[PDB]
Structure formats: structure tokens, C-alpha cells
Design a protein around this ligand. Structure first.
Ligand SMILES: Nc1ncnc2c1ncn2[C@@H]1O[C@H](COP(=O)(O)OP(=O)(O)NP(=O)(O)O)[C@@H](O)[C@H]1O
Ligand SMILES: Nc1ncnc2c1ncn2[C@@H]1O[C@H](COP(=O)(O)OP(=O)(O)OP(=O)(O)O)[C@@H](O)[C@H]1O
Ligand SMILES: [Mg+2]
Lengths: 396, 1030
């Protein structure tokens, strides 16, 4: 939105009047204001001639980024920002789909080390927290305050005053304090917020990459279950990575934005350990695995009938399978072999991940929804940017 | 004495300070100057030392009570004042039973043989007897004796469970067991044997053999109920809820495609197993569902009203157990009336727990909840936050933080958790439940911290079919399965086939109502579809409007056909026709219909709604039916017609007065106390009807929703519930419904009047005869007989028909429909004719007709065109003349009939006017009119209507002289006297009264009881100016 606007803020003063209506007649097409053809002069304008080519090719996201690139700026990475930045405080908000907590781990590791994750949970966490805050600034280690918004009542009383008082934090050793927000969620105090630097972690992983990150931790659990279970836990890693993938794209996809957690996987995996612990390892237990996963574990949140069916139809495909599943077009997952090694099967199922390459068309090929839907969604987020820009210009 | 007995060091130190302060005050008062007090020795020193010691006593009591509370953690539920009464009342012992209702929730009072406790009784009425009767002595603490009781009461439930369980296993009839075992116990025994008999039945597939078997127990229990004592009547009914669930599941199982299909269905259900293995018997029962098991704790529940089993219900029970298994809090969000707390309560009962419900933000103290939370974490109970969402942000934060401690304490299993700045221990049997009603914003949220501590679920209304089938089963089924499917399809079908109309509701509440209406109807006919079909048209139809009135008939007979003929066909009808003949009314297709629809509804429904256009016939329908019932039954009726919105909620329901909080009756509650409190006369044999004629709104119905409920009792704002008899029927007549909630509709019976009950002619017919009656009291029968003959021959319906049709083809200021104009005509016509009665004695028969026809043509004009432009009047005048006989006396704009001062004469002349002569000083005078062609014209008509006694609304532009014409016509005459009230945007109904009080004199004449006539003998006129201002 700021790209398209800022581009119009410069170019309307600088370029021709013939330019102004041409680009606005284009922003009108991306929006639902109008559909028209801009003013053409041979080799009169070429940058502009290139943009309408994006808009006429029905290609939305490309045309939206055009305004960013036309600025010819190197678009700064969290680390770049942090290094340039001249403050000991940062608050990075993000949508509930992700958390930059693990980006901050690799950010600290690659330069200046000193990483300390501090959950704000109960009284003990806040109480331990305030101790580790005052001491890390003397010491100069980096500190993180995970998901402050929840523990907020405390912020306005202790942290609001504490961070304001700490103009001795300027005096204190190289140290940087980080806080994680959620955009959709309770409002942080504006005074504290304006004082501290702000970032938005907009960084979304692919299906395969989330699968590999889900299945990645799973080896640290140890061993209390059968070999066969690791297959079910693998299945779930794919399943979870497929509903989360579907969460962003709405309306086409899910009716509403719904948020699925590490808690949702956990309550699903716990039911899986439980079904194998109670049954024979005959494969057929699969029937009520689906109903419980699709209606209590994951359908708990879901309220609309429309979406409850989507969870179910996903369970139909992810869970019920005999010999061959074919989660995605590229990848077939075969049922545990007679060799029956649990160490081997982890390594086999890890290898199935390492063999596959996530295609160009993932959102339509992998997530069972049509390609036509994806473009419809691309169109809608275009319309939203295009509108809000027009609206901004007319307001001033 | 008892409190100072328990605390010796505390009362010895209190009384020592009481001495000092007694001398300090009396010394300081006699000084006689407050300021003089600073000169007094050791006053700041004395009081600072005294307050320190008074604070040491309060603190010491606080340490005593908390040490008392920790010993018996039920006392956490009680609080200080109640707690002290218990320690004080120890001598008595029996006086603690009051407070048990609170600290248990299940029981109401305790049973003694004085020295020994024989058992307890529940709030439901159920009698539980203990195994060992607990012995009581003088030197015993409440803490010690009660703690034994809690133990024994749970043990006593295990006893009554094993005793019973064993019996049924030895093939005993369930009707036998009922009589001897408490419900809680028989329920669990049923569940465990059911479960075991169906568990085996999965392997064998002997389902049919067990099904009929169970079905027989159902029928057996049903017929037992009908002839049973009210107490045990609750117990059988409560068991029925459960038995029906049993059979339903088995039947579902008999049906399954495969064994895997059956083992899926069985996984989803709550399966109640027992350990025939182990010791610690109170831990011997456990429950399975979706793989998860749950230990039945043995708490007494009494006999609570048991929630009917739905698939949706089990799912809720399933999510609750899924949360609990992983040490997470249960939480469901969703619309109010989705019974989220009922579920949490029920899910507790099913596992032998009485869940504590915190009704949150119903002016609820944080201090009390903080105590309750400590109590719950000690006692290991389940607590449910009933609509958690509605808490104020400081409270919400404080509470939400506390709750996290508990849920975090359980998840980790921390032995002691700290909350409310103290180290208190945590039972792991503890759980917190949150119900989240939605806001105006959307479906509510848990605070962030609670999101990773709870599991949220979306409650949804039950797909109705399942609930319907059961309800049909309970009544006396015939074929319950067919009915339930058919009924729902029909209701579903009406919804997609009928017009989307405001007040139409075809959801379950509606079918539960059809089914509720059904019970008496079954008594009439059968436990058959036919009884269903009649109940459908008894409820569905009286609220339908003509287009949808056939959609109902079309699809009802399409989906199920029952019968040819109706009973109570002659009987009521002749009692209805004889009522209207007497009332003046005409028995029309429609009038009969809406009279019948109503008659049959009062029978079932106690709250009735009548919706229609103003002048539908609603007051006439109900007034006519009610009248017909006193002919057919022989029962008197006593009607109270109350304008709902004239009075305030305070004037009507009961107002409590802000400072002295003094309770005074009101209007609605006070007329019930004649019936309830002191039925001194004949009320038992009488029928009481309280009618609300005015527009109905939420605020007013909400304050009496309890009478509309299954309750049939009135809840005071403070300090009572008053029960309502079956005689006492509440009616509601109104013009629209837009304001009311669908909830309010569906508790009552609704009668939508699609069109006016009666024919235009039929209205006039009645109106005439109504007017004649008034005149019999002031006109001789010879005069009257001749004058009513005249009216019949002068105006025939055929002529007027076109005239009333042409009325519409005209601009009408201050719009009022043609039908409602009719009374304005008839009253005028009859009065103008009764005016010239003496000149009808001797006048020519041809000439007489001309006087009649003219007056009727006049009266008819003003009543249809009087509110018209008069440019339009003049237009209408030719229209009237047109449709009346051509030769008959024509109407002119200024047309009038005249007679001589000193000799009887007869001629028709118009527009003869006085001239006014007035001096210079007289020029402006607040009562001065320069008579015009139009002054006389208006003053004449205006005065004529008052002689009719019909109220007059004068509409027009400012300064047009509506006020002048009105005032001058009346400041002149002896008959009437004027009082002017000027209305503004916000004028009160007292303003009307206050203004009247100067010119009105109340007299208690036995003829009308209290009367408010005018302070002098001759008539009064209130002039209400700017009536469309308030
Ligand atoms: N026949 C008449 N002769 C002399 N003056 C008249 C006559 N009719 C009306 N007027 C004048 O018109 C004015 C009428 O005002 P008034 O009757 O007080 O208000 P209104 O027309 O009745 N409207 P409202 O009282 O607000 O419903 C007076 O001030 C008279 O001076
Ligand atoms: N069968 C009939 N024959 C003749 N006139 C009738 C008949 N039924 C009703 N009426 C006329 O309709 C009127 C009935 O008044 P009623 O109080 O019922 O109107 P309403 O619809 O209740 O108005 P509101 O909604 O303001 O209460 C009577 O004045 C009567 O003249
Ligand atoms: Mg009426």
C-alpha cells in the first residue's frame, strides 16, 4: 500500500499529466473502480508500458511488487535493521501463523551471540523475568520477552516504567532487548511502542519446509511408542502442515481465518499414542482416528459447517490409506515395512522429505483446492492494496 | 456467648479497649466543643494504640476462620458471616442444615435422630440415608463432625450403588430397584450393567434380543410413572432420560453396516466401567470415551433434571474429557441458549460431581470468587464460569491471572500453587470451565494467557430430529421414529416454502412447543400422528398469514394425512354464536376462525399474543371467546385490561424505592394477590385474564419472563416469587412485533390476524345497533322504533360500497384507514337524525327522507373526506351524490337544513352569517373571531362531533385557526367547558392529570366505584394542543 502510494506521491508531481491518468487508470483496473486501457505513446513511456503488461496478463502479485521495485531500494532484513538501529529495545509483531522467536535465535547466533529466551507465563515467569532483565543489561546479553501481550497487565506497571527509566540502558553494555507482539490482539501502550523500534515478521514457510520443521523436533521425544507410531506422527506432521497452509488463503480455502497451534498437533499426537496403546497394530483402527481428529482436536475451534467439512475431507485423505497414500501429487508414503526397525523408519520417512521438491503451483497442486481459486485470491489482495492507496491520496 | 466462649483471649482484649473508649467518648462529648478535643490529654496516643489493638483482634479472628476453613474446605464456600453462625449455632447443630444447601449444592437440609445423623435430603426432595449414623456430642466441633459426614455421604452412595448394581445383575425388575435406591445410585448401576450387556453384545451381535428387552424396561417405567408419588415421579423421569439413551445407542448399533462401524459408534459414547480387581472402592468406578478414561468420584448429586441425550451432547462430553485428559481446561464459546453450562453441569453429574457455577458479573464480588477458587483447589471440585466474557476489565485481568495459576498448577502438577498471595495446596482432581457467550462484536475470546491453558469448543443448536424422537417416545410413542422425521421435514419445508416473515420461527423451540401442546391433545385422541397433525395446526397455523396459510395446508397433507373430522365442532360454536349475538357482532368466516384458533389455544397456552392491524377485531375476538366460555363451562371470567406502556416498569411490576428500600406492590403484581394471597370470594371457580392492550417491548416482558417460563411464578426485583394459578391467563393484543425477541414469542401462543375479522357492512350493522342502545336510555321506544326504521331505508350497502372505495382515491391528511373511519360516520349519522326527532313527528314522508338522506350524505362526507383538502371534499361531494340516488337531496359545499325560531317550519338554506361590531380596544382579544363562511362551517361540524361524543383531532398548518374554531365554538356554549393542555417534545402523563385536577372532582359513587367527573355538573373538554409532539 505504501509502495503504490509513495510512487504516486512522487510521480504525479514529476511526470506528465498523460502519465498520471494512465497509472491511475491502471490502479483503477487492479481495484474494481474501473477497467480501462491507459494512454500509449510509442517509446514515450517504457516502465509504464511494462506495468500494464503485468495487469493485462491477469498477474496480480507481480504488478503489486512493481511499485516496490521502482523505488530501487535494498529492502532491509531484520538483522540489517537491528545493526543500523541505534536503540536497546525492539518490539516485533507478527500474525499468529508464525513467530519470529526462532528467527531471533539465528539472528543472534550469526552475530553477537548472547541469546536469552524468556517466556512471560505465570507469576514465576514475570518474577524471574524482571530479575533477568536488570541483570542482562549490566552483563550485555541479548534478551527476548516472548509473547508479552498476554502478560500485559504487568507491562503498563513494571515494563512501561522500567524501559522509560532505563536511559541508563544507554549507559549499559551493548545489550538489546526484544519483545514479540501479535497484530491481531491486545493493543500495546502507544507511549512504550513509539519509544521502541518496530518490525513485522512477515516471513511464511512453504508446506514442505513446515513439514520438515514439524518432523524435525519429533526425534527429541525419545521412545515410548511402537515403530508404527512414528508413521502416524509423520502423517500428522504432513496433516498439520496442510491445514496451516490452507489457513492463509481465505475466503477461498477456509471461510474464516482460523489458527492452529503446536497445541493442536500435541492433542492430536496424544490421541494417536493413545489409539495405538489401546489397539492391535492391525491398520484398520483408522475410522475413529479421523472423527476424533476432524471434530474435537481440529474441529473444536471450527464453528461454520462449511469449514468443518474441509477438515473432514482432509482427514479422509491424510489418514485413511492402504499401502499407498500419495499425500501430495509428488510424494507417496508407504505403510511401515515388515523389517520393523523404528530407527530405520524415522530415517526412511526423513528421506522421503529430502527426495521431494515443492512445486511452483504448491497451493493448488498440494492443497486439494483449484488453481482458479488461487488467482481469485491473488486478485482480491490486489484490490485491497489498490483501493486503500486511492483512498489515501483522495484524503489529502 | 458462644463466640466469646471460643475466643477467650480475643474477647478479654476487646472488652478492655471497650472500657477505655467508653471513657474517652463521654469525656470528650461533655467538653461540648469538637475543637476543645485537641486540648484533651493522650487522645492521638490513646486512639492510635486502640486502633492497633482492634486491628490485632480482627486479624486474629481472620487467622481462626482460615484455620477453620482449611480443616473443612467446604467452609471456603460459606464465607465469614455464615461461618460464624455455624460455630455459634453448634449448641443447636440442627441450625447448620440451612448452610449445607450452599456448601454442597446438592442437599437442602440434614436429618437427625438428634444424637445421631440418620442422613440428608437433597434440594430436589430425595432422601439419602447414611450407612453409619454419625454420633454427636457437646464437645465436638462443626469442623470435626461435618468432615465425617462428607466422607460417609460418598461412601453411602457407593454402598447404594454396589447394593443395587449386584441386584440387577441378579435379574431384578428395574421397577423394584427404583423404590429402594436413591437415583444417583440406580443411575450408575444402570450405566454399568447397560455398558456390560452391550459390551458383550458387540461380540455376539445379539442386539435385537437386548433391544426389545430394554424397550420393555422403558415402557415398564413409563406406566409406573403415571401412578407414582411425586417424589419418585422425578426419579423415574430422570431415569427415563437415560434408558432412552441406552436403547437409542443399541438400536444404532443393531443398524451398523459392519463391526468396525459399530466399534466407531461405541468409541464415541460414554462407557461406564468398574474395577472388579482392586481396593479404595470410591475409586473403583471409571468411565471410557474416545480412548480416555475418567474416574467417577462419588459425590452426591441428588436427582437433577437430566439433560436429554443428543449426539451433540456426547460430542461436548467428548471434548470436555479430551481437554481434561491432558490436564487442560474445558471451554465452550457460542450463542446464549446453547446450554454450555448445562453441559458442564451434566458432564460433571455423569461422573459424580456437583460442578460449582460462578455466574460472572451478575454484580458478583471478586472477594467472594477469590475465596471460592481457593475452596475449589482444596476440595478438588469443578468450577464453571457461566458467561465469563461479561467481567469488568480490572476483575477479568485479576481472575484470568488466578485461573492460569490453577490450570498451570495442574498441567505441571505443582503440589502447592500460589494464588491470592498465599501458599495453598492444589488437588489434582480440580478443573476450571469457561463458557463464552458472544459479544455485540462477535464470538467471545479467552484472554491470551488462557489460550494455551484451555481448549475452546463451538457449541451449536442440536439438529432437532434427535430431540423430537425422544420426546415422542416419552409421551407414549406409537411410532416415534416416523413422527420425528416427518415433523422436522415439514417444519424444515415450511421454512424453505413460506415467505420470510418477521415472527415466523420453525426451529426446534417451535417443535418442542408442538410437542408440549401435544400432551393434553393425546388425552383427547391418540398417541398417534393424528395428534401431532392437530397440534401442528394448533400452533403453526394461528400465526400464519393467508399466503402461507395454504403452504401449511399443502405441505402438511403432502407429508402426512391423518383425519377427516373434528370433535368440539357443534359445542363451542353455538356457545360462540350466542356470545356474539349478545355482543352485537357478526359470525364471519374469518371471525369464527380466529375465535376458534384462540379458543383451542387458551386450553394449552397460558400466555397468548394477538397481533393485527389497528381495528382487526382482536379485542372483539378474545372478548367474544372469553364470553363463550362462561356459557359452555359455567366458569366466570375476571378481566384486567392494562395498557402496558402507559405505566412504568415500576408502576406495573413493582418499584422498590431508592433509599428506604421499601417494597410497594405496583399494578400487575397487586391484581395477582387478590387471586393468590387472599382468594376471599370465588376465584377458584373463576377465570382470571390479565390483558396488555399496549405495544409490548423487551424491557417489560423481561421483568416477567418467569411467568412465561415453565416456572409459572413471578420473580420480584427483590424479595419474592409469586406463583400463578391455571386460571390466571396473560393475553397480549398489539399492532406490531418488531420489538420482541423470538424467545418471547415461542414461550407464548401467537394469533396473527391476517385481515379484519368482519365485513364493512357487518361493522356498520353492529355499530348502528350499538348506537341505538345509548339512545334507548334517552329516547322513547316509539321515537326510537321509527328512527331506526328510517336509517335502514335511507342507506343501503350497495351505494356506500363505491363511496368507501372512492375514499381511497383521495389525499388523506393524518392518514387513517377506511375501516376505522366507519364509527365516525355512524355515530354522527345517528346523532344528526336523533337531533331532528321532533320534526319527524309531523313532517311529510317524502320530505322526511330528504332530511335523512342529506344528513347521511353529510355525515358520510366528513367521516371519509373530513381530513381531506376540501378542494378534495368538494370533489368527494359530487362523488357521494353520484352513487346515491340522483333525485335524492344533493350535497353542496355549504349545504345546511334550517328551521324557524317561533314556528315549526322546513326548508334547506345555506351560508347566512352574522357580522361583528367591535371597538378599538376590543381589537386584540385572546377570544375574538370575525365569523366567516368557513368559521360557521367548521364550528358547526366540530360541535356536531362532540354531540356524538367521538373525539376530534384537528390537523392543519400553524395559524390556520384549529385552536380558534375549537375555542370559540365552546367558550360560547353552556354544555361544554374547556381546559387547555399544550404538549411539548417530552410531556408526561401526570401533566394531563395535574391540569385536570384543578377542574376535576373525584367522587366515590357505588355506580362506578371511583369516578373522575368534572368539578362542576356540565361537560368538560380537554384541549390537547400539539398532540404529535411528545
Ligand atoms: N376567522 C378569523 N378571524 C380573525 N382572525 C383569524 C380567523 N381565523 C384565524 N385568524 C388568525 O389566525 C391565527 C390563528 O392562530 P391559532 O388558532 O392560535 O393557531 P392554529 O391555527 O389553531 N394552529 P395550532 O394551535 O398550533 O394547532 C390568529 O392569530 C388569528 O389572528
Ligand atoms: N363481526 C363484527 N361485526 C361488526 N363489527 C365488528 C365485528 N368485529 C369487529 N367489529 C368492529 O371492529 C371493532 C373492534 O375493535 P378492536 O378493539 O377489536 O380493534 P383492535 O384491532 O383490537 O384495535 P387495537 O389493535 O387498537 O386494539 C369494533 O369497534 C367493531 O365495530
Ligand atoms: Mg382494541
Amino acid at each position: 500500500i505504501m509502495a503504490m502510494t509513495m510512487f504516486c506521491l512522487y510521480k504525479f508531481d514529476i511526470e506528465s499529466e498523460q502519465y498520471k491518468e494512465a497509472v491511475l487508470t491502471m490502479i483503477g483496473v487492479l481495484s474494481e473502480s474501473s477497467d480501462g486501457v491507459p494512454k500509449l505513446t510509442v517509446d514515450t513511456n517504457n516502465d509504464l508500458r511494462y506495468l500494464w503488461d503485468y495487469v493485462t496478463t491477469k498477474s496480480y502479485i507481480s504488478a503489486l511488487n512493481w511499485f516496490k521495485n521502482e523505488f530501487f531500494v535494498d529492502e532491509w532484513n531484520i538483522a540489517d535493521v537491528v545493526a543500523n538501529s541505534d536503540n536497546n529495545y525492539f518490539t516485533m509483531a507478527s500474525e499468529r501463523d508464525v513467530d519470529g522467536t526462532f528467527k531471533l535465535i539465528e539472528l543472534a547466533k550469526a552475530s553477537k551471540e548472547s541469546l536469552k529466551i524468556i517466556p512471560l507465563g505465570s507469576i514465576e515467569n514475570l518474577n524471574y523475568a524482571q530479575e533477568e532483565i536488570s541483570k542482562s543489561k549490566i552483563e550485555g546479553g541479548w534478551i527476548l520477552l516472548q509473547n508479552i501481550q498476554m502478560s500485559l497487565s504487568w507491562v503498563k506497571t513494571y515494563l512501561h516504567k522500567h524501559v522509560e527509566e532505563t536511559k541508563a540502558a544507554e549507559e549499559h553494555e551493548k545489550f538489546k532487548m526484544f519483545m514479540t507482539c501479535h497484530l491481531t490482539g491486545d493493543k500495546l501502550p502507544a507511549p512504550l511502542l513509539q519509544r521502541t523500534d518496530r518490525f513485522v515478521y512477515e516471513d511464511i514457510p512453504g508446506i514442505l519446509d513446515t513439514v520438515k520443521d514439524l518432523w524435525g523436533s519429533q526425534f527429541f521425544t525419545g521412545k515410548i511408542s511402537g515403530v508404527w507410531s512414528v508413521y502416524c506422527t509423520f502423517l500428522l506432521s504432513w496433516f498439520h502442515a496442510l491445514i496451516t497452509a490452507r489457513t492463509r488463503l481465505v475466503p477461498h480455502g477456509f471461510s474464516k481465518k482460523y489458527y492452529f497451534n503446536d497445541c493442536d498437533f500435541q492433542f492430536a499426537s496424544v490421541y494417536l499414542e493413545n489409539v495405538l496403546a489401546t489397539n492391535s497394530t492391525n491398520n484398520i483402527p483408522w475410522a475413529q482416528v479421523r472423527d476424533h481428529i476432524a471434530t474435537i482436536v481440529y474441529g473444536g475451534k471450527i464453528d461454520e459447517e462449511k469449514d468443518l467439512e474441509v477438515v473432514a475431507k482432509l482427514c479422509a485423505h491424510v489418514f485413511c490409506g492402504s499401502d499407498n497414500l500419495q499425500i501430495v501429487p509428488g510424494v507417496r508414503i508407504p505403510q511401515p515395512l515388515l523389517q520393523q526397525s523404528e530407527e530405520e523408519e524415522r530415517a526412511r520417512l526423513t528421506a522421503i522429505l529430502s527426495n521431494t521438491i515443492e512445486p511452483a503451483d504448491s497451493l493448488s497442486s498440494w492443497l486439494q483446492l483449484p488453481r482458479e481459486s488461487i488467482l481469485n485470491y491473488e486478485r482480491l489482495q490486489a484490490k485491497e492494496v489498490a483501493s486503500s492507496t486511492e483512498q489515501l491520496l483522495q484524503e489529502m | 456467648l458462644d463466640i466469646q466462649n471460643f475466643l477467650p483471649l480475643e474477647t478479654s482484649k476487646f472488652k478492655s479497649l471497650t472500657s477505655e473508649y467508653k471513657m474517652i467518648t463521654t469525656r470528650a462529648f461533655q467538653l461540648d466543643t469538637t475543637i476543645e478535643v485537641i486540648h484533651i490529654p493522650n487522645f492521638d496516643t490513646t486512639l492510635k494504640l486502640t486502633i492497633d489493638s482492634l486491628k490485632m483482634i480482627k486479624s486474629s479472628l481472620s487467622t481462626f476462620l482460615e484455620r477453620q476453613r482449611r480443616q473443612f474446605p467446604r467452609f471456603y464456600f460459606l464465607g465469614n458471616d455464615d461461618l460464624l453462625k455455624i460455630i455459634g449455632s453448634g449448641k443447636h447443630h440442627d441450625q447448620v442444615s440451612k448452610f449445607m444447601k450452599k456448601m454442597f449444592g446438592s442437599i437442602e437440609s440434614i436429618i437427625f435422630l438428634e444424637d445421631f445423623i440418620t442422613g440428608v435430603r437433597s434440594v430436589e426432595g430425595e432422601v439419602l440415608n447414611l450407612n453409619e449414623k454419625i454420633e454427636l456430642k457437646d464437645s465436638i466441633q462443626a469442623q470435626e463432625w461435618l468432615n465425617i459426614l462428607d466422607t460417609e455421604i460418598k461412601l453411602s452412595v457407593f454402598t447404594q450403588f454396589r447394593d443395587c448394581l449386584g441386584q440387577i445383575k441378579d435379574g431384578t425388575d428395574i421397577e423394584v430397584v427404583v423404590s429402594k435406591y436413591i437415583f444417583q445410585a440406580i443411575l450408575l448401576s444402570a450405566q454399568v450393567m447397560w455398558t456390560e450387556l452391550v459390551e458383550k453384545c458387540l461380540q455376539t451381535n445379539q442386539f435385537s434380543k437386548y433391544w426389545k428387552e430394554v424397550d420393555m424396561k422403558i415402557k415398564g417405567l413409563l406406566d409406573k410413572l403415571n401412578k407414582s408419588s411425586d417424589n419418585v415421579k422425578k426419579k423415574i423421569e430422570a431415569l427415563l432420560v437415560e434408558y432412552l439413551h441406552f436403547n437409542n445407542v443399541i438400536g444404532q448399533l443393531k443398524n451398523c453396516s459392519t463391526k468396525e462401524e459399530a466399534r466407531l459408534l461405541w468409541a464415541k459414547v460414554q462407557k461406564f466401567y468398574q474395577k472388579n480387581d482392586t481396593l479404595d472402592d470410591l475409586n473403583s468406578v471409571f468411565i471410557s470415551q474416545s480412548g480416555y478414561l475418567l474416574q467417577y468420584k462419588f459425590e452426591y448429586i441428588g436427582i437433577p433434571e437430566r439433560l436429554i441425550y443428543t449426539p451433540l451432547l456426547l460430542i461436548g462430553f467428548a471434548t470436555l474429557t479430551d481437554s481434561l485428559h491432558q490436564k487442560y481446561g474445558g471451554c465452550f464459546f457460542g450463542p446464549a441458549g446453547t446450554g454450555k453450562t448445562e453441559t458442564v453441569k451434566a458432564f460433571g453429574q455423569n461422573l459424580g460431581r456437583v460442578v460449582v457455577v460462578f455466574n460472572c458479573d451478575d454484580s458478583f464480588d471478586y472477594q467472594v470468587l477469590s475465596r471460592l477458587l481457593v475452596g475449589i483447589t482444596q476440595i478438588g471440585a469443578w468450577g464453571c464460569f457461566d458467561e465469563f466474557n461479561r467481567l469488568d476489565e480490572k476483575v477479568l485481568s485479576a481472575v484470568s491471572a488466578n485461573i492460569q495459576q490453577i490450570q498451570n498448577g495442574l498441567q505441571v502438577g505443582k503440589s502447592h500453587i500460589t494464588l491470592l498471595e498465599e501458599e495453598t495446596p492444589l488437588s489434582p482432581h480440580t478443573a476450571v470451565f469457561i463458557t463464552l457467550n458472544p459479544g455485540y462484536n462477535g464470538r467471545s475470546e479467552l484472554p491470551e494467557n488462557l489460550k494455551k491453558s484451555f481448549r475452546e469448543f463451538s457449541m451449536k443448536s442440536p439438529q432437532s430430529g434427535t430431540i423430537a424422537e425422544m420426546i415422542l417416545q416419552i409421551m407414549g410413542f406409537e411410532d416415534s421414529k416416523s413422527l420425528a422425521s416427518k415433523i422436522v421435514h415439514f417444519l424444515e419445508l415450511l421454512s424453505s416454502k413460506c415467505s420470510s416473515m418477521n415472527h415466523y420461527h420453525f426451529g426446534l423451540r417451535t417443535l418442542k412447543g408442538v410437542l408440549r401442546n401435544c400432551s393434553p391433545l393425546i388425552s383427547e385422541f391418540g398417541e398417534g400422528e393424528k395428534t401431532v397433525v392437530e397440534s401442528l395446526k394448533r400452533v403453526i397455523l394461528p400465526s400464519l398469514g393467508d399466503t402461507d396459510e395454504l403452504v401449511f395446508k399443502d405441505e402438511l397433507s403432502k407429508i402426512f394425512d391423518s383425519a377427516g373430522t373434528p370433535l368440539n365442532s357443534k359445542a363451542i360454536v353455538q356457545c360462540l354464536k350466542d356470545a356474539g349475538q349478545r355482543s352485537g357482532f357478526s359470525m364471519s368466516e374469518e371471525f369464527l376462525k380466529k375465535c376458534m384458533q384462540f379458543y383451542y389455544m387458551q386450553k394449552t397456552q397460558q400466555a397468548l399474543i394477538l397481533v393485527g392491524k389497528a381495528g382487526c377485531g382482536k379485542t372483539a375476538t378474545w372478548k367474544t371467546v372469553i364470553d363463550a366460555m362462561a356459557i359452555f363451562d359455567g366458569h366466570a371470567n375476571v378481566v384486567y385490561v392494562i395498557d402496558t406502556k402507559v405505566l412504568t416498569k415500576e408502576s406495573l411490576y413493582g418499584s422498590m424505592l431508592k433509599a428506604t428500600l421499601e417494597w410497594r406492590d405496583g399494578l400487575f403484581t397487586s391484581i395477582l394477590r387478590r387471586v393468590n394471597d387472599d382468594i376471599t370470594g370465588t376465584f377458584k371457580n373463576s377465570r382470571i385474564w390479565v390483558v396488555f392492550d399496549s405495544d409490548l417491548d423487551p424491557e417489560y416482558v423481561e421483568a416477567m419472563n418467569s411467568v412465561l417460563d415453565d416456572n409459572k411464578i413471578l420473580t420480584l426485583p427483590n424479595g419474592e416469587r409469586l406463583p400463578i394459578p391455571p386460571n390466571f391467563r396473560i393475553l397480549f393484543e398489539t399492532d406490531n412485533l418488531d420489538h420482541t425477541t423470538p424467545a418471547t414469542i415461542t414461550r407464548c401462543g401467537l394469533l396473527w390476524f391476517s385481515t379484519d375479522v368482519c365485513s364493512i357492512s357487518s361493522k356498520i350493522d353492529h355499530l348502528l345497533n350499538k348506537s341505538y342502545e345509548a339512545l334507548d336510555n334517552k329516547l322513547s321506544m316509539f321515537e326510537l322504533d321509527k328512527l331506526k326504521d328510517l336509517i335502514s331505508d335511507s342507506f343501503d350497502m350497495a351505494s356506500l360500497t363505491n363511496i368507501f372505495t372512492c375514499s381511497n382515491d383521495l389525499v388523506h391528511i393524518l392518514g387513517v384507514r377506511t375501516f376505522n373511519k366507519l364509527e365516525t360516520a355512524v355515530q354522527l349519522a345517528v346523532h344528526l337524525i336523533s337531533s331532528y326527532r321532533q320534526w319527524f313527528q309531523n313532517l311529510d314522508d317524502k320530505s322526511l327522507k330528504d332530511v335523512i338522506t342529506l344528513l347521511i350524505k353529510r355525515s358520510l362526507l366528513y367521516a371519509l373526506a373530513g381530513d381531506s383538502t376540501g378542494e378534495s371534499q368538494r370533489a368527494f361531494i359530487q362523488t357521494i351524490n353520484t352513487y346515491f340516488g340522483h333525485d335524492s337531496q344533493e350535497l353542496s359545499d355549504y349545504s345546511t337544513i334550517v328551521i324557524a325560531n317561533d314556528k315549526l317550519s322546513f326548508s334547506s338554506f345555506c351560508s347566512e352569517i352574522p357580522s361583528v361590531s367591535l371597538e378599538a380596544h376590543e381589537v386584540m382579544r385572546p377570544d375574538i373571531v370575525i365569523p366567516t363562511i368557513d368559521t360557521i362551517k367548521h364550528e358547526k361540524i366540530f360541535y356536531d362531533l362532540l354531540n356524538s361524543k367521538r373525539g376530534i383531532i384537528l390537523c392543519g398548518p400553524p395559524g390556520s385557526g384549529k385552536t380558534m374554531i375549537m375555542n370559540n365554538a365552546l367558550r360560547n356554549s353552556s354544555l361544554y367547558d374547556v381546559v387547555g393542555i399544550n404538549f411539548s417534545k417530552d410531556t408526561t402523563t401526570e401533566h394531563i392529570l395535574s391540569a385536570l385536577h384543578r377542574h376535576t372532582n373525584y367522587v366515590t359513587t357505588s355506580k362506578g366505584l371511583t369516578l373522575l367527573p368534572k368539578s362542576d355538573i356540565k361537560n368538560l373538554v380537554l384541549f390537547c394542543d400539539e398532540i404529535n409532539l411528545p
